[PDB]
Amino acid sequence: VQFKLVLVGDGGTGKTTFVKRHLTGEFEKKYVATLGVEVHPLVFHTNRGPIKFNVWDTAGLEKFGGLRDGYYIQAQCAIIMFDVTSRVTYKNVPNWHRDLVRVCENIPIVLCGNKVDIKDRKVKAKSIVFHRKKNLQYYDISAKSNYNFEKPFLWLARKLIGDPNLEFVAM
Amino acid sequence: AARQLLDFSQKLDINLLDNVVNCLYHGEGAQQRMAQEVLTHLKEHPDAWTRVDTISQNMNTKYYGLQILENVIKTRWKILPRNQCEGIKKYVVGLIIKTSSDPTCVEKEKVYIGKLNMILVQILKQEWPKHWPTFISDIVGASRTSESLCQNNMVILKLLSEEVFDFSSGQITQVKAKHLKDSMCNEFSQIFQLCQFVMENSQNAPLVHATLETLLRFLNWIPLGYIFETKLISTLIYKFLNVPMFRNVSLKCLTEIAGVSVSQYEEQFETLFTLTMMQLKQMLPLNTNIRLAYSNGKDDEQNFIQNLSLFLCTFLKEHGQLLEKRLNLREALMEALHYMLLVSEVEETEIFKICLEYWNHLAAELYRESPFSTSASPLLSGSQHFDIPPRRQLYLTVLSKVRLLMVSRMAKPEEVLVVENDQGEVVREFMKDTDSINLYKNMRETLVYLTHLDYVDTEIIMTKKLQNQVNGTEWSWKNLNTLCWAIGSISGAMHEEDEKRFLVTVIKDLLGLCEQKRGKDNKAIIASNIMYIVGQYPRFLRAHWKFLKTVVNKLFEFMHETHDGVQDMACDTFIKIAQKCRRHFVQVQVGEVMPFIDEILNNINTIICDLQPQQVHTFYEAVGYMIGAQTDQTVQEHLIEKYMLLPNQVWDSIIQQATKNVDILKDPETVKQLGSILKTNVRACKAVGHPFVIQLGRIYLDMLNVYKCLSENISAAIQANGEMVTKQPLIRSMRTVKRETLKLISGWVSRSNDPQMVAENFVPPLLDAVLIDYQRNVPAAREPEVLSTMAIIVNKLGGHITAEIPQIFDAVFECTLNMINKDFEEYPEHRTNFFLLLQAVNSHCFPAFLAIPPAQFKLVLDSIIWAFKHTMRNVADTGLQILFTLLQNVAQEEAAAQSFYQTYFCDILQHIFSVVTDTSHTAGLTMHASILAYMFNLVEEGKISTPLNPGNPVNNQMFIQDYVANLLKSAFPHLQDAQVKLFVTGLFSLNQDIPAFKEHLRDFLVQIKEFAGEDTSDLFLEERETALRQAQEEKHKLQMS
Amino acid sequence: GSLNELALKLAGLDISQDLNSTAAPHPRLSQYSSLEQSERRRRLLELQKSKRLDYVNHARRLAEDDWTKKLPKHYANQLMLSEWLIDVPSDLGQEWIVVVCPVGKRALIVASRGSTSAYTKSGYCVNRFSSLLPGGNRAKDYTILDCIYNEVNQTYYVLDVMCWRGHPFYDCQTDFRFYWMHSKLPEEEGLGEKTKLNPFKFVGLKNFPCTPESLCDVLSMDFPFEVDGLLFYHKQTHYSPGSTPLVGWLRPYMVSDVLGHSPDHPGCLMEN
Ligand SMILES: Nc1nc2c(ncn2[C@@H]2O[C@H](COP(=O)(O)OP(=O)(O)OP(=O)(O)O)[C@@H](O)[C@H]2O)c(=O)[nH]1
Ligand SMILES: [Mg+2]
To answer: What is the C-alpha to C-alpha distance for residues B219 and B241, in angstroms, rounded to an integer?
Structure first.
């Protein structure tokens, strides 16, 4: 009833903030870059009992990489993430995906535009096209306002359990 | 004793093999596991052998190992003992050889393999050409004997391929990539010759497929003759696509190929399309329901479907004038064009996005042919009218169907986000650019094009939909919402007169619909749609005022509606209608004597008494826009006073009571009230703009003294209880007044026709009230919005405020610097803001910087270095533009410039180089390069004064070349003096082409991360030595004119 | 102009079907769902006042947030609302009373479980707080009151009372309900005063008779607030949520028609 979700993206993406929002409904305004990884369990309750994503909150910065691919081992699903306010961070997406499937031949994955809330967005939804041919889901999220906040988890869930009409629930 | 770091001894394996299993399996201890394995990356890898050989969770543990090995190779390789280079070489080659063909390696996951293969790719990225010459050559034969060593070899070839064509941007220096390309290019035939071999003769499923896939990645670069002068495409269509498993790789390949530029290969593309389709028709029939086959189809067919989405869309999009120039292909593209429509009914707002990419492309193209309606009338002879333009004549029937699509699956026009501000505030939050809204707009575009191409058809359609809702019993909420959204899209895409007829018809029958239906769940949703529709057509409400009025009054009515959200519906609607039809509200209309606004104001309370906080705010913005119309300053004034008459009474009251007792401004309710009263005041000022000063003045000073009150009531609290006071009711509330106060002041200065006055009246009271107070606040209480409000209130005044940047920059500059100058974390706001502020005084007020103590000015630069050292991309980027800016602002003052160089120039170059060679700040790239670049340019002439100090025979050009080289050598001792000479001289060559200069910067970033070492001279020392010449011999073919 | 068939046609467009709503202006100023007949309906309304409803159950539910004409299942439309007073009653002398209501927000105040909370006619919470109303400081002994909240006076002027220390007054005729107010409101410790457990004063709205002389004197009074308009309760009406012709509202004037070089000087005045 649980799974291992590697959480990749580059630096300042909002990976850490995202999961932490998810784990407390706090919002962290401070940038403190994760050093190596730091796996946070998470739980949602659903149509079919409870489910737990083991969020391997990986780093972004080259400096503090860690054992990167080493963390992806035995990954059952994922989330490359980027920041719609810095074009650069979408350009490295392809690399993250790379390293990822070079460890996980077939594992449900999700790509996430974050920061959709800054009203000076520099990654026009026009420009996001990657997932398509690499056949990953894509979602527009903000961790500052909870726009499409749980899409990434609900999707993966539907995939790993093999249930399309699996809806989350309050309890 | 379970905590062991790893030094030398006869160092065991049964142990490490425990830490691994920890990190990957259990819990919080994993923190120290993970934290320890990061550290065995120090001295080296004399263990690599030790672990890899002597292998339960081995394969992990071996993994790790390979990581180390790989570090070793990616870098040290060069200065390795040559023989040991060989030792790895055969160590890996062999390791793979065995690890492949195994009576069970499915178990020994594709992992260990692929990372191993991956390593071999790494080695090759080092010597493949010069010191592995028989490689490709060999492994060919190496596969033609054994399938096992083959299947996998297809994968060596794959990764090699990506690594040298896809991901070589960044991971490799500029020239070494060129040399690996025309190297894979070179002997590619002997290996294409291989993949074919496989396809045509081998029957081993997995092998075949991993060759399709490895072919898929060949298709990004391989020369075109391999695709088109070969029976390849034929092999895929006839032989691989019709086949359930390879079904997909087959397509994706196709797709890729279908993406090239036909120039020379039109014949091949024609037959590839028709053939593909013979296949496809054979497979997924056209009488089949794609919607179910997806909803019900499993992942086996999901992707097939999405890749059809891509093959289709990308092809039709890139070979159209190819798919009509023959009466013979006309029927095939129709078949294909029909596929698109089926696929488009797919409930999957990501496939549908591809489909809609085509749809919109077509629409645009056939809008560029003719943007007009096929002149409606037959001809007097009866004949065909001949005015249908050459192309759409070919899609008429099918554009009818895409219109149907937009008006059926029309997307949600708006994206409201209920969600509560960082003040415990619960609000509605209107989003601007979201993948959502993008769906909306693109559908709108397509239906606007497809409306200009035959708007008679849109009208017709949208009426068959609405009919089918009233009686038609296609009735459902979702579908009604879609019908009226698509109605609201096509606004202004219709000859006015045309659309008068239209609307009246449409909504008339929707009022009829709304009576029909029993209930109030339905009566409301209907109504709401009527009101979007209606407010979507202000052209209409302007030519028909009796109606405008009627809709406004109805609006007001709904403003006491206690059914769900009907009230939010009404307010949105009213504010739309107020902004747009804003003029008719303040002028006298045929049918009555006195301007409608009047009645509205003379009735404010009775209209808006059943609203809640936000709703009333939005209402005040609403009548704002109206008062913003009346340009007659006398009446506009009278109107602004009676418009702000209700809140002003609250305010005036709270303000009497605060004379008598400045304690009530501590009263939780009366602050709830200074809050709401202000949110009003802000929206008001927003719609009203400049003349609103009449109001603002009225309270400005007092407002100030209360802002100043709350401020000192908060720091206090905070100072005596911790930042923790912030997370409680009243502090949050007070904060809110302060914020909405500053948002009031910036708000109004932001849109004022006058600078002089504002600077002379509304600025000096800020000083003591808001600025000095920010200084006097305790750090964890100083409001960040002060900085940003100051920032905004400097761009609007510029020169006028330049004389006071002393006074301001005092209150705030240093005191705030000290909050941002310990780490790069605490106080994120202050950081960002403070720096927008410095950005702006620098921009519009440089004279300031000119007239202050050299020690201060210095202090300002310093802070800027501090910006661009930031890891938060905004603080550092904003810091950069403040730098590039400031260099140029220096440029003007010939006087200050020179000295500026004689103190800071080199002392800036150190900082910028620092960041550039930092692995963290790589979004700087374009800014670093931009600045560094401009500065060297600058050097080659502009710096008229000697920095070395040995007179002129040590002229500056050569000086710099020198000190840069020295600076980098010493910070990077490994680089041979050659790598450095190369680079630095490339700083004055690539000098003017910053795309090129950027290229260069990265070139160097790779050079440092890898020990090039003595012997190795595969860095084509000279190749580029003349290469930069071609750059220098253009800067004067352009910049001498 | 055919669109004039919409101007009339957008006219007929209704969410409600409450006769003579006070949402819209007085059924004289326009010219559908509204007649000249207040008086008729009043009748059968009374003549059908043999309790069928479990009002007692209801007060609980309201006061405790537990949910299993008709009883309004949540917080919206719990207030008894006035229809414009049109048919000026034959028997107004000694059978009707009138509250000079003030300006502000109507609200269902529901004080139970140690809390107190004001809602709009639409189950929207507009304040939460502490009162001296039985149930709203600090026992299954709640209070429910129908109030206009005047912002300028931070006072909740009470209009009517439907529930008090756990006993529904919905079953009761207005002349009583109101007595119960004036007999029981000014008798709470501090309810009509401002403090740290009663931040908001609660003041009962006076009522008077509708006798010619009355309306007369009442129209020349001084009030502790700003006059919005006048309410008319048929002495003998129970308390039924939503529009009823048994409470007629009218604005203050209609009556005698109806049978008649710097900024500015700083208030506060502290440091520069
Ligand atoms: N405006 C906005 N800011 C965000 C959003 N999400 C995160 N942030 C900000 O982004 C930064 C968050 O940093 P992290 O979550 O650590 O991003 P990261 O570097 O990939 O995460 P770690 O390295 O694992 O710590 C902070 O500055 C937050 O203030 C968002 O959705 N909208
Ligand atoms: Mg990070």
So the answer is: 17
Domain that holds residue B41: 1-1041
Determine the Cα–Cα distance for residues C223 and B955; give it in Å rounded to an integer. Answer: 90
Q: Which domains does chain C have, with CATH numbers?
A: 1-272 (3.30.470.30)
- Residue window 250-269, chain C: list those with CB within 8 Å of chain B: 261-269
**Which ligand ends up closest to the CA of A14?**
1
Give residues with Cβ within 8 angstroms of B638, minimum separation 6: none
A15 carries a ligand binding annotation = yes
Q: Do the annotations mark residue A11 as ligand-binding?
A: yes
Q: Which residue minimizes the CA distance to atom 2 of ligand 1?
A: A115
Cα(A62)–Cα(B403) distance, integer angstroms: 49
The two structure tokens encoding residue C120: 């709009």
Angle between helices B174-184 and B110-131 (to 10 degrees): 90
Domain count, chain B: 1
- Domains of chain A in start order, with CATH, are 1-171 (3.40.50.300)
Nearest Cα to Cα of residue B348 among B289, B287, B295: B295
Q: Which helix (H) or strand (E) holds C245?
A: strand C242-250
Length of chain A in terms of residues written: 171
DSSP conformation class of B288: S
Cα maximum dimension of chain B: 104
Burial B542-558 (b: 16+ CB within 10 A, else e): eebbbbbbbbbbbbbbb
Give C106's contacts in chain B (Cβ within 8 Å): 609-610
Instruction: Give the residue whose CA is nearest to atom 8 of ligand 1.
Output: A14
A27: nearest CA partner in chain B: B422
Tell me the nearest-neighbour CA distance from A49 into chain B, angstroms: 23
> What pairing do the DSSP bridges indicate for beta strands C242-250 and C80-84?
parallel
**Angstrom resolution of this structure:** 3.4
Experimental method: X-ray
Phi and psi torsions of B258, nearest 5°: -60, 0
Taking an 8 Å cut-off on Cβ atoms, the answer to whether B610 and C106 are in contact is yes
DSSP string, B653-713: HHHHHHHS-TTGGG-HHHHHHHHHHHHHHHHHHHHH-GGGHHHHHHHHHHHHHHHHHHHHH
**By the CB < 8 Å criterion, does B616 face chain C?**
no
CB burial of C152-183 (b: ≥16 within 10 Å; e: otherwise) equals bbbbbbbbbbbbbebebbbbbbbbbbbebbee
Q: Are B409 and B482 in contact (CB under 8 A)?
A: yes
- Smallest Cα distance from B106 to chain A, Å: 12
CA nearest neighbour of B657 among B696, B605, B709: B709
What stretches of B370-495 show up as alpha helix (H) in DSSP? 396-409, 435-452, 455-470, 477-489
Q: What is the CA radius of gyration of chain A?
A: 15
What is the Cα–Cα distance from B623 to B613, expressed in whole angstroms? 16
On chain B, the residues whose CB falls within 8 A of the CB of A119 are 432-433
Ligand closest to CA A115: 1
Query: Which DSSP symbol is given to B638?
Result: H
Which residues of chain B make contact with A133, given a CB cutoff of 8 A?
252, 255, 307, 310
Half-sphere exposure of B992 (CA within 13 A, CB side): 13
In this structure, what is the dihedral angle of CA atoms B899, B904, B909, B915, given to the nearest 10 degrees?
Answer: -150
Ligand with minimal distance to B872 CA = 1
Q: Do B547 and C7 touch (CB under 8 A)?
A: yes
Contact: B429, A95; criterion CB under 8 Å: no
The closest of B263, B206, B207, B195 to B235, measured between CA atoms, is: B195
Look at B669 and C200 and tell me if their CB atoms are within 8 Å: yes
**In this structure, are residues B319 and B269 in contact, taking their beta carbons and an 8 Å threshold?**
yes
Contact C121 B706 (CB under 8 A): no
Identify the CA nearest to B622 among candidates B666, B578, B556, B678. Answer: B578
> How close does chain C come to B884, measured CA to CA in Å?
39
